[PDB]
C-alpha cells in the first residue's frame, strides 16, 4: 500500500500540472479525469498490474500459501535492479525509510483525494485558494 | 592580528585597529575579516577603475549592449549610476547570477575553507589563468599581497568617494558636482 500510494501521490500532484501531449480526456482534477479518460487505458493498466501481481505472487496469494518458505521476507519480491540491498550497512536505513515514506504517502494520498472531493478543484489550485487573499 | 599581512611602514610598521575590533576576534574571526577585506578590495578596485574609465571620457565598448532592446553602450550615458540604471534588467540579473554562481563555487570548491584552516581571500578558481604569479618567490608574493591590500583599501575609499559625490551634491573636494 505504501509503494502504491507513494506512486499515487506523485501522480496526483503532477497530473494537475503536466499532461501527456494530446492525451484524450485530460482534466487537472484527477477524479473527473478518471471518467474523462478512455476506459481502455485504465483497463490496460489494471491488466498489467494483475499480470505483475500474479507472476510475483505465483502460488502465494493467501496467508497460508505465502511465507511458507522461511527465506521469504515481507515486501522482498526480489525487485532491486540497482542492488542497493547488497550494501548491508544501509539496508536498515532504506527499509525504515521505505516504511515511513509509504505510510506518509498513504496518508498524503488520502489527503489529496478528499481535498479534491471537498473543493472540486485540483490539489495546488485548492492550496492556492486556501493561501489566497481574505 | 599581529602576525597577519596588511601592516606597512605607513602605520609605524604596526597594526591599525584603534577600536579593538581584532581583540574580540579568534583565528576564524580574523580569517573572516581578512576574507571580507580582500574581497572588498577586489570589488572596489574593479569598481573604481571602471567608474574612472567610463566617467573620465575613456573608451566605451563598441556596439549594442542589447541588439534587440536597442541600447548602445554610448547611449547608456557614460555616467555610473545612470548607466547602471539604463543597463537592461536581464543584463543585471545575469551579471549578478554569474557572480552568485562564482561565489557559491568559491565557497564550495576552495578546500580547507578560509574559515576552517585555509588562506583567507584566495580563489584558486579565479587567479592567474595564464602564468603570472605561479612562479614568483615567497617574499615578492608577500610584498605584492601587501600592495594588493593597500591599494585595495585606497580603492574602497575612492569608490565610496564617488558614491558620496553622486548622492551628496558636492561632498568630495576635487570631484565634479554631477558624479
Amino acid at each position: 500500500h505504501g509503494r502504491i500510494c507513494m506512486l499515487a501521490t506523485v501522480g496526483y500532484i503532477m497530473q494537475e500540472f503536466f499532461s501527456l501531449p494530446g492525451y484524450p480526456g485530460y482534466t487537472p482534477n484527477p477524479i473527473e479525469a478518471v471518467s474523462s479518460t478512455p476506459p481502455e487505458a485504465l483497463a490496460q493498466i489494471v491488466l498489467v498490474l494483475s499480470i505483475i501481481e500474479f507472476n510475483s505472487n505465483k502460488d502465494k496469494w493467501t496467508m497460508d500459501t505465502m511465507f511458507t518458505d522461511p527465506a521469504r521476507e515481507p515486501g522482498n519480491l526480489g525487485f532491486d535492479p540497482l542492488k542497493f540491498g547488497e550494501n548491508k550497512e544501509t539496508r536498515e536505513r532504506l527499509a525504515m525509510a521505505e516504511l515511513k515514506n509509504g505510510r506518509l504517502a498513504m496518508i498524503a494520498f488520502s489527503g489529496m483525494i478528499h481535498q479534491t472531493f471537498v473543493t472540486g478543484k485540483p490539489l495546488f489550485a485548492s492550496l492556492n485558494d486556501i493561501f489566497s487573499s481574505p | 592580528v599581529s602576525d597577519m599581512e596588511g601592516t606597512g611602514p605607513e602605520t609605524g610598521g604596526k597594526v591599525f585597529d584603534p577600536m579593538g575590533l581584532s581583540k574580540i576576534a579568534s583565528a576564524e574571526t580574523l580569517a573572516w575579516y581578512r576574507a571580507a577585506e580582500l574581497k572588498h578590495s577586489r570589488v572596489a578596485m574593479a569598481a573604481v577603475t571602471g567608474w574612472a574609465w567610463v566617467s573620465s571620457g575613456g573608451p566605451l565598448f563598441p556596439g549594442y549592449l542589447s541588439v534587440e532592446q536597442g541600447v548602445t553602450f554610448e547611449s547608456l550615458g557614460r555616467d555610473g549610476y545612470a548607466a547602471w540604471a539604463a543597463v537592461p534588467e536581464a543584463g543585471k540579473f545575469q551579471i549578478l547570477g554569474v557572480i552568485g554562481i562564482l561565489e557559491i563555487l568559491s565557497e564550495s570548491a576552495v578546500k580547507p575553507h578560509y574559515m576552517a584552516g585555509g588562506t583567507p581571500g584566495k580563489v584558486p578558481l579565479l587567479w592567474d589563468p595564464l602564468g603570472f604569479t605561479a612562479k614568483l618567490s615567497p617574499e615578492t608574493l608577500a610584498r605584492k599581497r601587501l600592495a594588493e591590500l593597500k591599494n585595495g583599501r585606497l580603492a574602497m575609499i575612492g569608490v565610496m568617494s564617488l558614491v558620496s559625490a553622486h548622492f551628496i551634491p558636492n561632498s568630495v573636494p576635487l570631484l565634479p558636482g554631477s558624479v
Binding site: - | 573608451p59 595564464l130 602564468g131 603570472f132 605561479a134 612562479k135 614568483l136
Partner: protein, 236 residues
C-alpha cells in the same frame, strides 16, 4: 639562455641602465613550457620585432618622401606611382591590390615556417629557439634543399659578414638589439603621428595623417575576401 645571460646581454647593451625587467614574463612558464623555452621565445620575439621595425622605419621614411618603384604592378595598370599617390605609407598599403597583399603576407608566412622548422634550422646548424637554440637565427634557404635550388639566402645574400669572428658577431648582435628597440619605438611614433595627430611632439605636422586601422592588413577594397567587410565595419 638563463637570466644570467639576459643580464650579461643587458649590460653589454646599456652599461648605465643594465637589466630592466619589471615584468614577470622572463619568470613565467609560457604555455606550460620551461624557463629556457620562455626566455628563447621572448628573445626571438624581441629580435624579430626589432628587425621588422628597422626594416619598416626605412620603408616609411623612403615611401613618405616618395621613392616609389618606377615599374608598374597589376597588368590593367596601377603603377607604384599611383599606389604612392594614394596617400601616406599606410594609405599606400591599404590601397595596394588584394593579391599583392596576400602574396607578401604568405611569403612572410613561408619564411616563418622555414625559420621555425627543425630540419632547416638543423641543416643550417642550430636548434629551435625554445629548445636550446640561438635566438634570431634564420636558416639558409639553400641548405634546406628546395626541389628547385635558390641562388641566395636571406641572411648573407653575398656574405658581407662572411668569415669575421664570433666575438665580433655577438658584439654586433648587441647593436642589432639596441637598434631594433630604437626602431620599434620610432615606427610606433610614426604610426601614432599618422593616426593620433599631435601624439608625437617632434613629428607634429610632418607625418601625413591617416584614418585606416594600421592593425588591419586588408581594406574595404579587399572586402572580396571572406569575413573582411564585416571586420572593417567592426573595427574599433
Amino acid at each position: 639562455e638563463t637570466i644570467d645571460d639576459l643580464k650579461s646581454l643587458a649590460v653589454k647593451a646599456n652599461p648605465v641602465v643594465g637589466y630592466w625587467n619589471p615584468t614577470p614574463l622572463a619568470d613565467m612558464g609560457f604555455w606550460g613550457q620551461s624557463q629556457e623555452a620562455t626566455i628563447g621565445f621572448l628573445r626571438h620575439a624581441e629580435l624579430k620585432h626589432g628587425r621588422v621595425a628597422m626594416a619598416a622605419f626605412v620603408g616609411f621614411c623612403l615611401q613618405s618622401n616618395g621613392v616609389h618603384f618606377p615599374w608598374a604592378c597589376t597588368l590593367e595598370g596601377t603603377t607604384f606611382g599611383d599606389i604612392a599617390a594614394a596617400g601616406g605609407p599606410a594609405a599606400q598599403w591599404d590601397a595596394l591590390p588584394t593579391n599583392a597583399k596576400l602574396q607578401i603576407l604568405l611569403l612572410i608566412g613561408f619564411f616563418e615556417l622555414l625559420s621555425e622548422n627543425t630540419y632547416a634550422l638543423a641543416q643550417s646548424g642550430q636548434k629551435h629557439y625554445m629548445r636550446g637554440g640561438k635566438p634570431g637565427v634564420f636558416p639558409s634557404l639553400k641548405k634546406v634543399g628546395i626541389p628547385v635550388p635558390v641562388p641566395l639566402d636571406l641572411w648573407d645574400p653575398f656574405g658581407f659578414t662572411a668569415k669575421m669572428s664570433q666575438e665580433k658577431k655577438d658584439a654586433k648582435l648587441v647593436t642589432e638589439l639596441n637598434n631594433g628597440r630604437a626602431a620599434m619605438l620610432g615606427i610606433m611614433g610614426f604610426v601614432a603621428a599618422s593616426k593620433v595627430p599631435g601624439s608625437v611632439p617632434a613629428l607634429d605636422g610632418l607625418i601625413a595623417p591617416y584614418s585606416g586601422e594600421v592593425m588591419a592588413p586588408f581594406s574595404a577594397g579587399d572586402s572580396a575576401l571572406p569575413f573582411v567587410e564585416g571586420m572593417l565595419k567592426a573595427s574599433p
